[PDB]
Recover the amino acids of this structure.
RNA sequence: UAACCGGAGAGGGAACCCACU
């Protein structure tokens, strides 16, 4: 039913459950997300 | 919430630094662990469970005789002589309830050591083991499906034997839920524990990817099954599907690509788990060497002996097995030229990754678990008493029930079960008439603490009313 | 540096005869 997408995909199960709402991070978002994680990973 | 999860995760990482017992800290593989599980040690049935080093229960016995009886001091010694003569252990894992349980453990040690009752011809030390996870792993549903005839004392002895075998397999045999039944901080209930459960799962995945998992035990032993639920890329459904595949077609693993040759697992998912699946048998399939580094690890092993290759995957056996025996030559390999060849074939800066490839060629399937840590008194006290000395504080009033006089002193216990010795300075004697006016023998009396020496069976208890304020 | 015990409202009726104040 709902386990076929977990077991029959070419994506990891932990990787599926690590970006479940929106999957993947593109190339143009990569540097902006790196700078955002650099600003936000420092507190 | 962040610092509470950090304080909980520090205790989790401490508890996720597993250190089960091994033979001499290395006939047969493993140690024949005889776990003892007491119920009251007061003329109550105390159980023993001999589980071998392969991870399976082998024998069991009872012990309803103890030294209840007030004067027959060799009946427990005679019963332990007749039981240890009917058992072939290699390590004795004793639990603990009170300090009388420590005296019973000392009597068991006097029976084992003073008669060579550790192998029937040679003394083998009895190890003190805390019992907090085995008391909550004998009530689990997994321990209710290994046997349905015996009480929870035999399951507690079996849980102590399995914990002495491996604590990560116990953590890999409790659902995660069941991790939230072990408390490491007294403020983890007020905060949300969904991210705490995901951090516990992150630490379990970290431990499982550092140590590694064997697949030839997940199709034979049920205790060593359900280990793919914490592997990289293999979740609960993928681990259960892998176990169903390996138990439905009777599939065994002779290499790492057996789920790619038979179409059991995804290609990218298999490349994610190309350094987290290990088999007992190619030769670099029970290690972290991926299939894109097979002919580089084998090239560095051929270069580690100056042996000409026979189209090496297994054919140049002198360069491949003699390097698994001992490090043959590491001065014939140069990681600068290796990284330069990796920057023209392979296409990637692998210069310190080849140090890990060399470590896998030397001793593959290395375990990052720490060494076994023996109980050092505060670890013993916190284990058998379940109370730490940081909880008590100078300034608090505690009820103590006096039991015996030592010669003039006040020997009593607490409600938590800690033996406290109040000296004559508070009782108001040195050798003079004695402290009945201060406290009543047998009864319990509240007193203000002024010292914390619970490890050495000492407690400062002011019996004067002027010192309580 | 100790010490074993434990469970409680039962339960019927109809018919006839004898006797008491």
């Amino acid at each position: 039913d709902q386990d076929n997408e977990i077991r029959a995909t070419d994506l990891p199960e932990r990787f599926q459950l690590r970006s479940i709402p929106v999957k993947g991070a593109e190339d143009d978002e990569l540097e902006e997300e790196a700078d955002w994680i650099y600003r936000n990973a420092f507190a | 919430k962040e610092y509470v999860i950090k304080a909980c995760s520090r205790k989790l990482y401490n508890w996720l630094r597993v250190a089960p017992y091994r033979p001499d800290q290395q006939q047969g593989k493993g140690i024949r662990v005889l776990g003892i599980a007491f119920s009251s040690a007061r003329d109550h049935p105390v159980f023993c469970a001999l589980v071998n080093g392969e991870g399976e229960v082998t024998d069991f016995l009872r012990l309803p005789h103890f030294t209840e009886e007030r004067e027959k001091k060799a009946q427990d010694i005679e019963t332990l002589k007749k039981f240890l003569l009917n058992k072939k252990p290699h390590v004795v894992t004793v639990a603990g309830e009170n300090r009388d349980a420590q005296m019973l453990i000392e009597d068991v040690k006097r029976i084992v050591h003073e008669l060579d009752q550790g192998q029937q011809l040679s003394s083998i030390g009895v190890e003190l083991v805390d019992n907090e996870l085995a008391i909550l792993y004998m009530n689990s549903k997994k321990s209710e499906a290994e046997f349905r005839d015996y009480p929870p004392v035999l399951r507690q002895a079996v849980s102590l034997a399995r914990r002495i075998q491996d604590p990560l397999i116990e953590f890999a045999q409790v659902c995660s839920e069941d991790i939230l039944c072990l408390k490491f901080h007294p403020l983890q209930e007020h905060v949300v524990k969904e991210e705490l459960l995901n951090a516990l799962y992150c630490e379990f995945i970290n431990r499982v990817n550092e140590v590694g998992v064997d697949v030839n035990r997940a199709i034979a032993h049920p205790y060593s099954q359900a280990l793919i639920q914490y592997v990289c890329g293999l979740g609960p459904r993928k681990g259960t599907h892998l176990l169903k595949i390996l138990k439905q077609n009777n599939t065994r693993l002779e290499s790492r690509t057996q789920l790619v040759t038979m179409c059991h697992m995804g290609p990218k998912v298999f490349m994610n788990c190309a350094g987290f699946l290990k088999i007992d048998t190619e030769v670099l399939d029970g290690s972290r060497v991926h299939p894109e580094t097979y002919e580089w690890a084998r090239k560095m092993a051929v270069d580690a002996l100056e042996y000409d290759e026979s189209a090496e995957d297994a054919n140049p056996a002198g360069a491949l097995e003699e390097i698994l025996e001992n490090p043959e030559r590491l001065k014939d390999l140069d990681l600068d030229a290796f990284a330069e060849e990796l920057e023209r074939q392979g296409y990637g800066d692998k210069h310190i990754t080849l140090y890990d490839i060399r470590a896998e060629l030397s001793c593959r399937y290395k375990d990052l678990r720490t060494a076994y840590r023996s109980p050092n008194t505060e670890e013993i006290f916190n284990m058998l008493t379940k109370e730490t000395p940081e909880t008590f504080y100078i300034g608090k009033l505690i009820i103590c029930n006096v039991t015996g006089i030592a010669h003039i002193g006040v020997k009593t216990r607490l409600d938590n079960g800690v033996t406290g010795f109040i000296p004559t300075k508070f009782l108001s004697d040195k050798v003079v008439k004695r402290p009945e006016e201060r406290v009543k023998v047998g009864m319990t009396v509240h007193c203000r603490i002024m010292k914390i020496d619970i490890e050495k069976f000492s407690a400062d208890l002011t019996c004067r009313t002027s010192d309580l304020m």
